[PDB]
Amino acid sequence: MFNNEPLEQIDKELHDILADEEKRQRETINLIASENLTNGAVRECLGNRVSNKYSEGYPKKRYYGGNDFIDKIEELCQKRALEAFNVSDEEWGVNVQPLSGSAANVQALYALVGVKGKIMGMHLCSGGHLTHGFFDEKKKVSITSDMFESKLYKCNSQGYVDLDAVREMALSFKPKVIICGYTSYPRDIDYQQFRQICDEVNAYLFADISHISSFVACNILNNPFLHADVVTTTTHKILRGPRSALIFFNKKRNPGIEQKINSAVFPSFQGGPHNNKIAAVACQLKEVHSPAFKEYTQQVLLNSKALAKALISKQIDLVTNGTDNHLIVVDLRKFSITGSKLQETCNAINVSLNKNTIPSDVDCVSPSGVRIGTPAMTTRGAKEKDMEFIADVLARAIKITVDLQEQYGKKLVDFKKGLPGNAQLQQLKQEVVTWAGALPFP
């Protein structure tokens, strides 16, 4: 008693937009640092009937019948997660049920500190996440600043984490958790240094490695598992998995953390797991552990180094003057333009990026930077040689932006008036589409 017609026949309106979205994807230079493109295997999992199952609880301890195969799927995922990060299942445990990074982080923090608990995070303007305790004067923007008491450490004027400031703050504030690992931080992390600071104030060490997860797995960047109590990561970014998250806990450093973390995920916060996610994560995790994915990850950094190099060669300023990973933040101050305007210009030419703050910024709405990343284009087979081209495309977008600000003015509404029908933008978009459309598309 159901309709079985395929999507095209059953919902032609929706299918058209999705075909449109697909085309836009195929024809964009995607520089969103947090984006990637999943393979068919991961999407076959997301589309699977395994999402039919209600399976509240944990494997072997469900609140429903019919969970025999779901248990195998949940355990294989946990297995592959611990494998992927080269941690012994004896020392480290993992929860594979958080629906997304924001959820995982809120869950993990509560497990560690509870309501009104004290937490320390990097500020949003400095590269930190919303879920790292963010608030402004006016409002408690994230729940992490409301259900928890938070204080926020800023990076220095150069854009690097100031460990001195971190220690200064920890000794006065006395938090139960300190969060490191970031959303738009272009440099590696001194985890050991964080560990020594946490030890001084009897605080937990929280490493959110969502952006840099593939580097950690493939042993290309610092390994937070050597020092961290809790490691979170999303699966949809550099890891190239589906949209989901993982919570890792050091059982050996903290006995009874397993129960604490697991009870926080369920039944404190979530209900039924999304088993299609868990299946998809499992699939990607197998791939994460291969020598071939290590190659992909290496190429991500090769590409990011080259892109930084080529942008510098064109007189563009970068926060920290380079990168240790997949991501770059461009400081646009010398051009007297905003990230907001550069975002609109880049969208008009099919270049995906986002506006981003820099250390000197005081404005969340009008930032002085854009953030770019290589994981998506690296997935699409782009190499170091291709980076000069992206660098050139961005330079030209910056120039065009300066011109349009000259013609139409500083107001964002006024500025957008110049984008449609602009001859150079049309020429640039076509230039973008031609190269982007030809690249391998999973």
Next chain:
Amino acid sequence: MFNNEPLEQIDKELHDILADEEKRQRETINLIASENLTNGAVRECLGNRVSNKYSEGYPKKRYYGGNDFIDKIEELCQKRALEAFNVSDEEWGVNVQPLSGSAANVQALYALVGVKGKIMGMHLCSGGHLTHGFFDEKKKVSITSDMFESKLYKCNSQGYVDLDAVREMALSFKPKVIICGYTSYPRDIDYQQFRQICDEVNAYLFADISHISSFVACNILNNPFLHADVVTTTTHKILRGPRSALIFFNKKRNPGIEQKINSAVFPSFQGGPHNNKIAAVACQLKEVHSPAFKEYTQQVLLNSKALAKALISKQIDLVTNGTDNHLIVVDLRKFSITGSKLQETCNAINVSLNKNTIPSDVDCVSPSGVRIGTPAMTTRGAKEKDMEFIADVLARAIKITVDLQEQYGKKLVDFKKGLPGNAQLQQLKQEVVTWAGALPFP
């Protein structure tokens, strides 16, 4: 620079379990009240590349470029959501980003009351959800009992919502929110009555209709939208959508609630939306509004009435002695067995259900009932005549459970010893598989 081998070739281990799960689903009599089976169209959406996109914020108000088609999909979902529940976009608004029912509820509650805020909900043992403020004497089981201050109302010994008790509690406790609409409540709800109590005490009216959403939409049961400030519902249950949730808010009753709810979903709790979810919800909502889905929803109740009738004819006791909806709770006390045991026995025969508490219950690990539901089997084309068979199968499982308890004992571990190889169970499972395996399967 990726792998494009299909799931079968890329990950054979995982593909086998999924095919195993698919086989089990096809050959199970699914009586889990919160379960359904999605069509291929909904699964093509969950599998779509649209999940590649990061689109934090709201349509037209994104924090990333290249969201032109993502905006159309998020808007068409809001459009179809309000359409399906027969509400005007001028009076009612909706958020389509909550990832699941538990998140949406925590999100919606925070919006209304904030941290330390006061809320009222039905007790878990009485039929209410975890996210309705549930706590134990020992522990604050749900975050809804911890980040909020909660009180819990119990149904009477007959299993009906006791409005006297609700009012008595509301006048003393003075909550800011009162929650109605439930997880395992077999009767319709007097929303008007709740509204009168909420008015008296200046409390918001919260109706969580996840279990009964299709009834509300198709105007087969009481409409909470006539009276409620906030309406939440998951999409994966009787709605037969993907795993996601919706928050509805009455703008006419509460100006400024839109910003409150929207900011609570993001950036208070979540980060990037799951666009494949939104696409899938949109697709199912078109179907919800059709006269053909009204037919399906009618069948669900016709089947649930019949099944209740047939169980009573076999001397099985029901909570409230019947049903107003898709769900029944069987009181097993007269048989001196637990739901836990009946759940294992039913799993052994390919009958999916869950153990459920009853009003006299004081125990959560071992309850005195099972909960059953018709949405899945109705989806599979089963009619009123088919219900006698399901009733017969359950009666037979109950008997086998009494026998096995006599032989092996009251300990759950001891009891399970008797399940494998049992000739009657093998006979019953085969009877189950034959009939279920031949039913239409989306």
